[PDB]
Design a protein around this nucleic acid. Structure first.
Ligand SMILES: [Zn+2]
Ligand SMILES: [Zn+2]
Ligand SMILES: [Zn+2]
Lengths: 187, 292, 103, 78, 187
RNA sequence: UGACUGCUCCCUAGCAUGCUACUACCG
RNA sequence: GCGGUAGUAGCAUGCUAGGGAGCAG
């Protein structure tokens, strides 16, 4: 309140009225002793009820503008994370076996369900039981999707390496059974 | 997070923020430790900080607790009371507080380098638990200063017994390898087993304690854990036991020692004992004696 | 009036998800929102159904005597029971099933 | 009564067994989940006290994990 | 209440206006005094309502604090507590099978698998000492979990097939006593 | 790891209205 | 004697936001 431009009048009117109490004041000067700090006090309160509103308004943009900054800084951290993805899932397209089906296409459009089926290098087979295993993945090589795949690893549900000799007809009760066979393309 | 101010034996929940171990101080230690010593930071179940976008006034000085959080002066949502007032700091146990008459404990030990003679001599006239905390702060200051040192590395593998090592440039480097350097290695981005190496001689001659396989770029730096709080005194009051009851003495007695049955009966009727023994003063063969 | 299955309201106070209701004093609002659902069981002709509501009003009081008695024996704090007694009285819940909506 | 005290001790027995990382063997966690889901659906206190022996024996066959002696001399069954 | 700095105004003016009717005076003096009582009374019924709100507000923040600190000691001690809960609850059930496999597995006779409920139901326990064998099983009959099994094979540490006739507080000190007894359920 | 909707209880901050006393100028 | 005007404190209502929790499909 030490810089409000209505402190001078209030201060002076207080001094004139209050400080001059000991001195004999007649009933005519008493009006000046009374109706001089009055009105001035009203105006000061008016000069303080507007300052309090300007302060709050001000401290509602120095908070709503930190939030406009925060979000743009964030908008630049996700815009650079999707970019770092769509350029890492691209360096992975064996562009000899992929430009060989987009080319044999009538216009260059192909179904998406035949891209991993004809242009992939690895196969993952998930097998529930032993009966399913001998009709799908018997031996070290097997044919699927008009191709030939050679087994490379057989992990299990626990993710521990199984060998192709632990898989018997009677040792089967001793394996975590969802078995995951990883195979590579041949030729 | 309800520990104990053992500077008063008071049960509190605060702790000095910018302090060595961040120990538990009551409402009457953390009141005077902050005003004189500049530890304008206290840590509670939630840190005493501003809670409004961007604020950087974090000093439990005149911070006011209102609206379920600690606001500040400069921007004023005051409508509340200050955190530090009436010879106390706000927090749980604000009523059950005792106080301390030795004000300048932190004022003397939390600012110095934990090496002055005066600190040690006034420490050796303290109680058992305060000195336990002083020893834990000595271990903690050693470990804190353990991460303000240098790091070794090898970027070029050379023929055996002739390598080169640079430590650092322009910083204040002697170390009596007492505890030797076992860092861990790096090849591209992950950690690789290296083992433990010993550097004594030192182009620069290298000795070998055990066979190893140097790789390019292997770093060496020491990581040390933090000593956990303990719950037991060091010394014990003197209290002679009732008798030697509850033991199983043996019929046979040694005869090459002429001071064996007397000391056996003594330890039988004595509780705790300390001596000043040079090497070879019973540590060699008397342990077997009391064993048999 | 609609009323639930008693085994659903009883079994919702016994089985939860930790810190939730493995300590009732840290959440007494869970049991005021479960006694609102159990209120119209007080009108049931079966007296084993009408007891599920009086069991929830007796536990909310137990969880309040403890709370205002656990912060008096470890921290010298004294809570005032003014405007807390409404949650173990069967008139805060009776007003949720009567017209002339409020709030 | 007695069928509700067995149905609440098998909820605390598969939480002790889930905090000991028995979830990392999916050939034994698949039996413990079947002995706990079956006790909760039981309708006799003679065929739920016998799946509580199979389920409890999983904890007493895990050696070091649980200190049985300390835990029984802790103001409990001696 | 008392002790508030603004309290020596609702005491002097309250005492004055009070005594003032016995001695008495003009209506002017009475009005003057009342227009000092109310002028320095608002100052009391304003500084003793703000406090009235701070005194209860304080006792709320210092209750959320008590909740954020008990709910972090209730969560950091989960392990130690549910094991105590389980054994407080296992004693109250007072079963016979449950109170056998617990006492047996405290002296040493723990199982090596799940206790099966079928009729073949092979079992494997580890008897650590002769007394535990003498109490539990005599002959070819074994009592466990309030059921009777028939011993089908006894095995010492490595593979030492002990015959039932040579385990008798005698030949017994000469073996590796952690045995692995195999049995099958009865009926 | 934790979807889309709807209803509802409790606590805190802000805005306007509704009967009063206090101020002060004005009638 | 009364009315209007501008601040200040105090008690309830509705609405707009944030936070925690409960139920239903
Ligand atoms: Zn400090
Ligand atoms: Zn203290
Ligand atoms: Zn702020």
């Amino acid at each position: 309140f030490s810089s409000l431009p209505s402190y001078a009048a209030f201060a002076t009117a207080q001094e004139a009225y209050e400080q001059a109490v000991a001195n004999g004041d007649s009933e005519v000067v008493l009006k000046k002793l009374k109706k001089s700090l009055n009105v001035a006090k009203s105006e000061f309160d008016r000069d303080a009820a507007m300052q309090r509103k300007l302060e709050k308004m001000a401290d509602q943009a120095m908070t709503q503008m930190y939030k406009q900054a925060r979000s743009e800084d964030k908008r630049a951290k996700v815009t650079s994370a999707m970019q770092t993805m769509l350029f890492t899932m691209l360096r992975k397209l064996d562009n000899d076996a992929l430009n060989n089906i987009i080319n044999n296409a009538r216009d260059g459009c192909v179904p998406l369900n035949i891209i991993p089926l004809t242009t992939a290098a690895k196969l993952m087979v998930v097998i529930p039981d032993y009966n399913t295993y001998k009709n799908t993945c018997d031996g070290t090589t097997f044919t699927y999707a008009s191709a030939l795949w050679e087994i490379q690893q057989v992990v299990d549900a626990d993710s521990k390496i199984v060998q192709l000799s632990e898989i018997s007809m009677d040792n089967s009760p001793n394996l975590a059974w969802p078995l995951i066979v990883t195979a590579l393309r041949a030729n | 997070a309800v520990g104990a101010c053992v500077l008063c034996n008071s049960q509190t929940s605060l702790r000095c923020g910018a302090c060595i171990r961040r120990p538990f101080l009551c409402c009457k230690c953390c009141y005077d430790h902050v005003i004189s010593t500049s530890h304008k930071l206290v840590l509670s179940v939630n840190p005493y900080v501003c809670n409004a976008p961007g604020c950087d006034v974090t000093d439990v000085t005149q911070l006011y607790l209102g609206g379920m959080s600690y606001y500040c002066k400069s921007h004023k949502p005051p409508i509340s009371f200050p955190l530090c007032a009436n010879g106390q700091v706000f927090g749980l146990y604000k009523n059950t507080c005792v106080g301390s008459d030795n004000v300048t404990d932190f004022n003397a030990i939390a600012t110095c380098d934990w090496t002055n003679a005066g600190d040690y001599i006034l420490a050796n006239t303290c109680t058992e638990r305060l000195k336990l905390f002083a020893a834990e702060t000595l271990k903690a200051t050693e470990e804190t200063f353990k991460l303000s040192y240098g790091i070794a590395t090898v970027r070029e593998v050379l023929s055996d017994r002739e390598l080169h090592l640079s430590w650092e440039v322009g910083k204040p480097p002697p170390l009596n390898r007492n505890y030797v350097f076992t860092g861990y290695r790096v090849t591209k981005n992950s950690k690789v087993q290296i083992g433990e190496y010993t550097f004594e001689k030192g182009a620069v001659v290298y000795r070998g304690t055990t066979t190893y396989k140097l790789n390019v770029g292997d770093y060496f730096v020491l990581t040390s854990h933090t000593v956990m709080p303990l719950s037991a005194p060091t010394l014990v009051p003197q209290e002679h036991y009732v008798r030697i009851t509850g033991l199983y003495p043996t019929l046979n007695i040694s005869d090459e020692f002429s001071s064996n049955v007397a000391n056996y009966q003594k330890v039988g009727m004595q509780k705790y004992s300390t001596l000043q023994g040079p090497p070879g003063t019973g540590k060699s063969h008397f342990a077997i004696g009391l064993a048999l | 009036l609609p009323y639930p299955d008693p085994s659903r309201i009883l079994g919702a106070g016994c089985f939860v998800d930790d810190i939730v209701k493995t300590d009732g004093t840290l959440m007494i609002e869970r049991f005021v929102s479960l006694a609102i659902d159990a209120y119209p069981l007080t009108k049931h002709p079966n007296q084993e159904y009408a007891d599920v509501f009086h069991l929830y009003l007796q536990y909310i009081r137990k969880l309040h005597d403890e709370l205002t008695g656990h912060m008096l024996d470890m921290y010298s704090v004294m809570l005032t029971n003014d405007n807390t007694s409404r949650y173990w009285e069967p008139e805060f819940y009776e007003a949720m099933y009567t017209p002339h909506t409020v709030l | 009564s007695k069928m509700s005290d067995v149905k609440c001790t098998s909820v605390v027995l598969l939480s002790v067994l889930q905090q000991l990382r028995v979830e990392s063997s999916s050939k034994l966690w698949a039996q413990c989940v079947q002995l706990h889901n079956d006790i909760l659906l039981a309708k006799d206190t003679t065929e739920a006290f016998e799946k509580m022996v199979s389920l409890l024996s999983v904890l007493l066959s895990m050696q070091g994990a649980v200190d049985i002696n300390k835990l029984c001399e802790e103001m409990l069954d001696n």
